[PDB]
Amino acid sequence: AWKGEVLANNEAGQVTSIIYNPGDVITIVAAGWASYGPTQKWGPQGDREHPDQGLICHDAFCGALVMKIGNSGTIPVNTGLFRWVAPNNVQGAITLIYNDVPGTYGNNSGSFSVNIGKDQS
Amino acid sequence: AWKGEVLANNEAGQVTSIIYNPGDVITIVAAGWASYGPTQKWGPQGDREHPDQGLICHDAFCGALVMKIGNSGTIPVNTGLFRWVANVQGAITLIYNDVPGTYGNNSGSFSVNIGKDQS
């Protein structure tokens, strides 16, 4: 049961209190409005119209919510995950990150409100 | 225990297998790209720039996911609901947030998962 925020302009991400363990089943709901530069704002799925220019997650759009579990590569979160189990050999603290190009977070604004819970297993 | 899709052009909503009962704790997660007219698509939170011209849900943007429970007013769903508790009682119908009579030109759909949680 973690609840908190993820700033668009935070390159390092938001480390949550959720340690993902082998067999854990998780739910995530992400909401909100944030920008990677422009005056317009996008939701947790990001901007489907914008080209990939070196995103930390190539499998999500610019401005999408992504995560790392432990020492994993980025995993798309987008609007959330429903009763979700990680690939085998993936474990450790969940960090939530705004999908942008490394070095380009200065002009980002807004944030995502995210809830994460462990489910019956 | 319910998984499927909600079409933008379905005025009448998607009637799900979830009957909401007093005290029930539920989770919805909605995903995908849909439209209420334009060639451009929006997500489950809808179009934050477009004004309200008599949307079925005044509490959400045009093109947002909403729902009804039984005979109730529209309730915002947006990207989903996390361990949400609702006198609201009955079958959960999911609906695209648009204006009555004008669904004909909508396109796309949202993916939606609903479950009941521990309580």
Ligand SMILES: CO[C@@H]1O[C@H](CO)[C@H](O)[C@H](O)[C@H]1O[C@H]1O[C@H](CO)[C@H](O)[C@H](O)[C@H]1O
């Ligand atoms: C659409 O924003 C900017 O477009 C120009 C073209 O005129 C360039 O392609 C820039 O790279 C774009 O900058 C924005 O996007 C990148 C991510 O791709 C980054 O977030 C930057 O901070 C933004 O301004």
Ligand SMILES: OC[C@H]1O[C@H](O)[C@H](O)[C@@H](O)[C@H]1O
């Ligand atoms: O505001 C709602 C309204 O917006 C646009 O004009 C659409 O083309 C219409 O079909 C209707 O959905």
Ligand SMILES: [Ca+2]
């Ligand atoms: Ca940026």
Ligand SMILES: [Ca+2]
């Ligand atoms: Ca329409």
